[PDB]
Amino acid sequence: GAKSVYERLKNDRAPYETRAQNCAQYTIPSLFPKDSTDYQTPWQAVGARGLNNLASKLMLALFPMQTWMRLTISEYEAKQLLSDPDGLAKVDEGLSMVERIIMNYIESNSYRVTLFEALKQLVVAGNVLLYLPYNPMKLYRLSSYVVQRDAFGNVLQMVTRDQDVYTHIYLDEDSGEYLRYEEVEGMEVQGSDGTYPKEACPYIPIRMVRLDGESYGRSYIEEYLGDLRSLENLQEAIVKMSMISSKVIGLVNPAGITQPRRLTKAQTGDFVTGRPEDISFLQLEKQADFTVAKAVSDAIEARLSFAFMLNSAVTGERVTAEEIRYVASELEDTLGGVYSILSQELQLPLVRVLLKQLQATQQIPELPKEAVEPTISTGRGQDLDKLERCVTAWAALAPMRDDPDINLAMIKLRIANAIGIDTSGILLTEEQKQQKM
Amino acid sequence: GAKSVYERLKNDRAPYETRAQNCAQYTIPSLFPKDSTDYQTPWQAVGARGLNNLASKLMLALFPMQTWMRLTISEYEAKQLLSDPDGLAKVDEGLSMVERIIMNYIESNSYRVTLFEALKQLVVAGNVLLYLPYNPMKLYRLSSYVVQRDAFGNVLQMVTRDQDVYTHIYLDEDSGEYLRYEEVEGMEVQGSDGTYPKEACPYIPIRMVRLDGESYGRSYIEEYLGDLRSLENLQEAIVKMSMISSKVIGLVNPAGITQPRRLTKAQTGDFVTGRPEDISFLQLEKQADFTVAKAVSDAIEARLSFAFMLNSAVTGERVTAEEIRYVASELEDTLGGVYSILSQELQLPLVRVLLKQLQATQQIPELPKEAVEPTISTGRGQDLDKLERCVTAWAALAPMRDDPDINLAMIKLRIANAIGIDTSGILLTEEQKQQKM
């Protein structure tokens, strides 16, 4: 409603962020600043790199910058019945152009690099963006914003912080569209309320892990703190290996003849006048940690990687690309749980909002005919795979075309049922054949 | 009946949850919160990742988001006799459209990511969802709900908790359809009773392990606490490896000449004025744990994985995808015990409930003609495999077509019996042959 204060909202958010400070701490801070400061860093490089690696993967997959978004009609039973007759061609002109415009917009409006700087962070739990009319995006963080619902995941009251500038984006009563004003510490800047029709206009927070739900969601690399094992281990081996073999102080008894200055002067093969070995070193005693530590770190790297999707072409691996391709595909889905969640905070929202802000009538041109609800491609995946198998078999049945005992057409249809591509373009009817012959 | 209190129901549920706190504890909490607070975590990353990996697998398999659900007629002996005559084509139009609508509904209504956040948890013992009319789902947890039967697994009295909001979903007497009201702590909110025709409308709890049965079921990763071996082992090796090789305190006797500040100052090759080695380190004595621990962890990983159906594309394994494909298929069934149980808390219920809530007459359009009971595809599996073998053999018999001693047709029919694909589309009759020749 009307209060308005983000202090109460921040109080509601503390545990989610802190779990985030941590997660930030062992990878590539920053990302998050801990809570004159000379730098501190992440020793455990492998944990940090993976995060950067994912990002490329995430950005590309979420949208390849060629043709990601397909705006669908989608068919109403009279809209599919008119057109017919074959105005569908100009439905394509209206849409492709919108599709032609957005693909020249978003790359042209430089969201992608900005999205990538924010997206990567999202692999740390997540964050709000986007404004409308150079027109860039902005990238509010977990130090900044507070949001709610008691709900299934919707938006009720958004709060923001950058400089001090607070925004209220409240869902209203006796209402519908949102209303959103900005404030200073009392009361209003006169940049007034926009009702904001539902999600459209603007600016949705992306959830990421959805558990259980009623929060600004807590994900993710928090599911992987087997890196804690690597980072601690790497540091344990390094100091212990480093300090003993370098810091070799020379103890002398200052009782006489052995004088430190003369000792440095003689060359390796030199003789030096000294008491009988009075001065001696304090090189440390036997230190272990070798075998267990090394294997585990290597073992941890292998376990860690399949999380951060790396092609991981070790053997290395030779034979080779198909094997590499198979490795990528089985591994890729592992993230396929995420894709659905990512898509929900991203494709629908991203295309949905700009399209809604492209209702401005500036060359969007149609005031959208509901519904042109559009969704986002991406994996099908299996359809290429299911289809491929018939060729491997069908190829098998080429030799037996001549034999008269069994009907080949019936047999393919049997294999056809095994790979769920059934009919409609895969079976050839009798009427068609003479035309050729 | 009418009481109404979830406190009594929660009391009935304690052991099932706690076994769940635990199971949560060694994998990726959270999931479950244990029972300010900073963070504690799962060291044993491999146990945690597997759970995430399964999820992708589970979601995809349970429903690929292409064409999972096949609504069947199913044939009544006059409905199969009328149609004929060949109105079956418009039975397909009525159904496909329902099928065309649900496939555009569920992906379009964003259940899938929400289902995935809940589904994964289900690989921890399980949980309730779904509401009717943005229209998302909600994802009640083991901290929330209580349910019963003395029975074979049905539903008698459901209780819920989110904020305080309690729901009663009681099976009634002198009855039939369910009735469901919501309450505050006395007595009713006037969102009144819906009879709810049996399962339809709404909102079935998913069981998962069915043992013995009469409960909110207790599964699963509780069948695998050979991870306890890995997690404990990983932590035992890590602290022991870490603490000794890093924390090297320098003991000095404060009796004189050896002064701590001077000691740090000299460079590795420096000489330092000191008593004859008075100060000395307390680097710990020989510590074992190397050989036994490492192999077992590696051994445990191998044993653990075939549980969480990782592709396990190790050698690596170059030969290869057919080999990779065979590995996936034999391994996949291992979970095939689960699929039946998963399907029962999922495909029937999920399609059954929305179809029942699509009886609203909003474009579902038919008030369903009983029975259109629909079921869910998914493995058959063997039928592709059984069928494939005839081609490998039949191919073998191509060479002997010319020889006159033995009848080839009779021989194929013999092999045909070996691979249970018998007849009906695999044998060619005499009448057919001339047409071609």
Author numbering:
A (entry chain c), B (entry chain b): 12 to 46, 51 to 148, 155 to 184, 212 to 362, 365 to 428, 434 to 492
Authors' account:
The lower resolution of the portal structure in the capsid II suggests that the portal might be flexible to some extent or deviate from 12-fold symmetry during the DNA packaging. This movement causes a squeeze between the inner capsid shell and the wing.
Escherichia coli bacteriophage T7, a member of Podoviridae, has been used as a model for understanding the DNA packaging mechanism common to tailed phages and related dsDNA viruses. At the beginning of phage infection, the tail is responsible for receptor recognition, and the portal and tail act as a tunnel for DNA delivery into the host cytoplasm.
